């Protein structure tokens, strides 16, 4: 062991390095304390002919352009044309880069932490919603098993069906089970007055989904803008829409946060929406029958003082060709006039009274 | 001049009181807050600034897009202020 | 309550150290310390002058 006796000197040199890094690593707090302003960064690779070529183009908020190479600490998500970077008074070096927003009108579209309703609020849809509950639970907790089996969850699920069925409050009810950040987005929001806004909205959606923590982005009314016209505004929505499909087709690292979509009608079906990353999960959600409407209306009305003498035959007969949110409006209306009816207990005539009231 | 007489005699302590309250960075308004230490602020000159919160202002008293007094030397928020027609 | 007529003696040591320190005089605030010996009331002599590491505070 005489040859291994020199390792002690090496360990003393290494622990001496750990003893001497406290000062030069301690000045990181006083030099990198606070970037006083915000400056935009534009990446531009240079060539010096080590003597290697590496540079970047800087633009300050006060419209002043300077010169500086690519510097700082170990960069992994950096080197992109972003904003909100670290900068000193006049040295103009890059110390702390963090991606920034602005145009808060799109950043704060729907800031929801978690909803209140859960999946146990409906009745008679487990045979078709269980695939989605699995498709949101197993890709969140069973990421370890995805390497033994080599499974990548799909990113596009088509939640299509007739309107009024509750395709938004139910997907939100499953978003309560996702436990991730919920972020809504409307179809018509892409149609703006200025040019090129849809690119900023799409790259913003993948900017918060790509940059932020694992979240949930549910969109709706996609059919209202998914028109395949052959000037035209829906062809501009083909520029933005086909741009989004290009970001769901040309991006293999799209294994991150999913993009859930829902269409209120499948009349104008875009044929280019078929792909593993695109809307491949096509589970048909038809109009609930009087039995299913009595189930979702019973579980949605399990909180009000409902009379126990309900055979569901009269309401089952009156509810003809109705939807889920329509019976939800009947439940809410019953909870509205049942107050002014004097009797604190919900009666049986209030069902048809609400059906003929709002419809 | 009669109104400026008693205030002119009361202008002596304005020299010893000139050292404080001198801070004025054009009352720059903030935009949002990613984390509690660092606050993203934008001045009226279209220059976005970032500074840490001072010890004289509580973090619960900060509102989104609120015009408050802020230093131009230490860049910190000394004191807020309550204030269209 | 008494005052005299003082005059600061400046050799080439402090001068050249303030010239190299002026070459290192970046826009960022810098710090330095002067040394010397006090022989009487109305004269002051500087001999040793060095620089100080910069800081974000200035």
From Swiss-Prot, chain A:
Key words of the record = Acetylation, ATP-binding, Cataract, Cytoplasm, Deafness, Host-virus interaction, Intellectual disability, Neuropathy, Nucleotide-binding, Nucleus, Phosphoprotein, Proteasome, Ubl conjugation
Biological role stated in the UniProt entry: Component of the 26S proteasome, a multiprotein complex involved in the ATP-dependent degradation of ubiquitinated proteins. This complex plays a key role in the maintenance of protein homeostasis by removing misfolded or damaged proteins, which could impair cellular functions, and by removing proteins whose functions are no longer required. Therefore, the proteasome participates in numerous cellular processes, including cell cycle progression, apoptosis, or DNA damage repair.
Q: What is this protein called?
A: 26S proteasome regulatory subunit 6A
Q: Where in the cell is it found?
A: Cytoplasm; Nucleus
Recorded hits in Pfam families, A to Z, give: AAA, AAA_lid_3, Prot_ATP_ID_OB_C
Q: Which disease is it linked to?
A: Deafness, cataract, impaired intellectual development, and polyneuropathy: An autosomal recessive disease characterized by early onset of deafness, cataract, severe developmental delay, and severely impaired intellectual development. Patients later develop polyneuropathy of the lower extremities, associated with depigmentation of the hair in that area.
* PANTHER family, A to Z: 26S PROTEASOME REGULATORY SUBUNIT
Its quaternary organisation is: Component of the 19S proteasome regulatory particle complex. The 26S proteasome consists of a 20S core particle (CP) and two 19S regulatory subunits (RP). The regulatory particle is made of a lid composed of 9 subunits, a base containing 6 ATPases including PSMC3 and few additional components. Interacts with PAAF1. (Microbial infection) Interacts with HIV-1 Tat.
Question: Its family?
Answer: Belongs to the AAA ATPase family.
Phosphoserine, modified sites: 307
Q: Which GO terms describe its molecular function?
A: ATP binding; ATP hydrolysis activity; identical protein binding; proteasome-activating activity
Domain of life, per UniProt, equals Eukaryota
Q: Where does ATP bind?
A: 161-168
**What's the encoding gene here?**
PSMC3
From Swiss-Prot, chain B:
Instruction: Explain what induces or represses this protein's expression.
Output: Expression is not cell cycle-dependent and occurs throughout the cell cycle.
Describe how it is modified after translation. Monoubiquitinated by RNF181. Phosphorylated. Dephosphorylated by UBLCP1 which impairs PSMC2 ATPase activity and disrupts 26S proteasome assembly.
Q: Which residues carry this modification: N6-acetyllysine?
A: 44
- Could you tell me where this protein is found in the cell? Cytoplasm
Family membership noted in the UniProt record: Belongs to the AAA ATPase family.
As for what it does, the entry says: Component of the 26S proteasome, a multiprotein complex involved in the ATP-dependent degradation of ubiquitinated proteins. This complex plays a key role in the maintenance of protein homeostasis by removing misfolded or damaged proteins, which could impair cellular functions, and by removing proteins whose functions are no longer required. Therefore, the proteasome participates in numerous cellular processes, including cell cycle progression, apoptosis, or DNA damage repair.
Quaternary structure note: Component of the 19S proteasome regulatory particle complex. The 26S proteasome consists of a 20S core particle (CP) and two 19S regulatory subunits (RP). The regulatory particle is made of a lid composed of 9 subunits, a base containing 6 ATPases including PSMC2 and few additional components. Interacts with NDC80/HEC; this interaction is detected only during M phase. Interacts and SQSTM1. Interacts with PAAF1. Directly interacts with TRIM5.
**Protein name, as recorded:** 26S proteasome regulatory subunit 7
> Which taxonomic lineage is given here?
Eukaryota, Metazoa, Chordata, Craniata, Vertebrata
User: Shown portion of the whole protein?
Assistant: 73 to 160 of 433
Swiss-Prot record, chain C:
Where does the source fall among the domains of life? Answer: Eukaryota
The entry's note on the tissues where this protein occurs is: Widely expressed. Highest levels in heart and skeletal muscle.
Function, as annotated: Component of the 26S proteasome, a multiprotein complex involved in the ATP-dependent degradation of ubiquitinated proteins. This complex plays a key role in the maintenance of protein homeostasis by removing misfolded or damaged proteins, which could impair cellular functions, and by removing proteins whose functions are no longer required. Therefore, the proteasome participates in numerous cellular processes, including cell cycle progression, apoptosis, or DNA damage repair.
Provide the assembly information: Component of the 19S proteasome regulatory particle complex. The 26S proteasome consists of a 20S core particle (CP) and two 19S regulatory subunits (RP). The regulatory particle is made of a lid composed of 9 subunits including PSMD4, a base containing 6 ATPases and few additional components. Within the complex, PSMD4 interacts with subunit PSMD7 through their respective MPN domain. Interacts with TXNL1.
Q: Which family does it belong to?
A: Belongs to the peptidase M67A family. PSMD14 subfamily.
Q: What is this protein called?
A: 26S proteasome non-ATPase regulatory subunit 14
Native organism: Homo sapiens (Human)
Q: What is the lineage of its organism?
A: Eukaryota, Metazoa, Chordata, Craniata, Vertebrata
């Amino acid at each position: 062991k005489i040859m291994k006796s020199e390792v002690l000197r090496v360990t003393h040199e290494l622990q001496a390095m750990k003893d001497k890094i406290k000062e030069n690593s301690e000045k990181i707090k006083v030099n990198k304390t606070l970037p006083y302003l915000v400056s935009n960064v534009i990446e531009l690779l240079d060539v010096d002919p080590q003597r290697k070529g590496k540079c970047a183009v800087i633009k300050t908020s006060t419209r002043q352009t300077y010169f500086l190479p690519v510097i700082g600490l170990v960069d992994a998500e950096k080197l992109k044309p972003g904003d909100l970077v670290g900068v000193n008074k006049d040295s103009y070096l890059i110390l702390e880069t963090l991606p920034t927003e602005y145009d808060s009108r799109v950043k704060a579209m729907e800031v929801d932490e978690r909803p209140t309703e859960q999946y146990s609020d409906i009745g008679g849809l487990d045979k078709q919603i269980q695939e989605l509950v699995e498709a949101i639970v197993l890709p969140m907790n069973h990421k370890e098993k995805f390497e033994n089996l080599g499974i990548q969850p799909p990113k596009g699920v088509l939640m299509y069906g007739p309107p009024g069925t509750g395709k938004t409050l139910l997907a939100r009810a499953c978003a309560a089970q996702t436990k991730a950040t919920f972020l809504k987005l409307a179809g018509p929001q892409l149609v703006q007055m200025f040019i090129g806004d849809g690119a900023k909205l799409v790259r913003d959606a993948f900017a918060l989904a790509k940059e932020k923590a694992p979240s949930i982005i549910f969109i709706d009314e996609l059919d209202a803008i998914g028109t395949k016209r052959f000037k035209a505004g829906d062809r501009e929505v083909q520029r933005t829409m086909l741009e989004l499909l290009n970001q769901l087709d040309g991006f293999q690292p799209n294994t991150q946060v999913k993009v859930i979509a829902a269409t209120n009608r499948v009349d104008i079906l875009d044929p280019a929406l078929l792909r593993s990353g695109r809307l491949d999960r096509k589970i048909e959600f038809p109009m609930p029958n009087e039995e299913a409407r009595a189930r979702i209306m019973q579980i949605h009305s399990r909180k009000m003082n409902v009379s126990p003498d309900v055979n569901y035959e009269e309401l089952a007969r009156c509810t003809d060709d109705f939807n889920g949110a329509q019976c939800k409006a009947v439940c809410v209306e019953a909870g509205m006039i049942a107050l002014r009816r004097g009797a604190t207990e919900l009666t049986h005539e209030d069902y048809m009274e609400g059906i003929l009231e709002v419809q | 001049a009669p109104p400026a007489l008693w205030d002119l005699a009361a202008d002596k302590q304005t020299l010893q009181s000139e050292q404080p309250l001198q801070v004025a960075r054009c009352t720059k308004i903030i935009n949002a807050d990613s984390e509690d230490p660092k606050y993203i602020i934008n001045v009226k000159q279209f220059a976005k600034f970032v500074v840490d919160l001072s010890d004289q202002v509580a973090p619960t008293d900060i509102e989104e897009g609120m015009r408050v007094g802020v230093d131009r030397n230490k860049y910190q928020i000394h004191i807020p202020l309550p204030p269209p027609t | 309550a008494v005052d005299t007529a003082e005059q600061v003696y400046i050799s080439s040591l402090a001068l050249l150290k303030m010239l190299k320190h002026g070459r290192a005089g970046v826009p960022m605030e810098v710090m330095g310390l002067m040394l010397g010996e006090f022989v009487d009331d109305y004269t002051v002599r500087v001999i040793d002058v060095f620089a100080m590491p910069q800081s974000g505070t200035g």
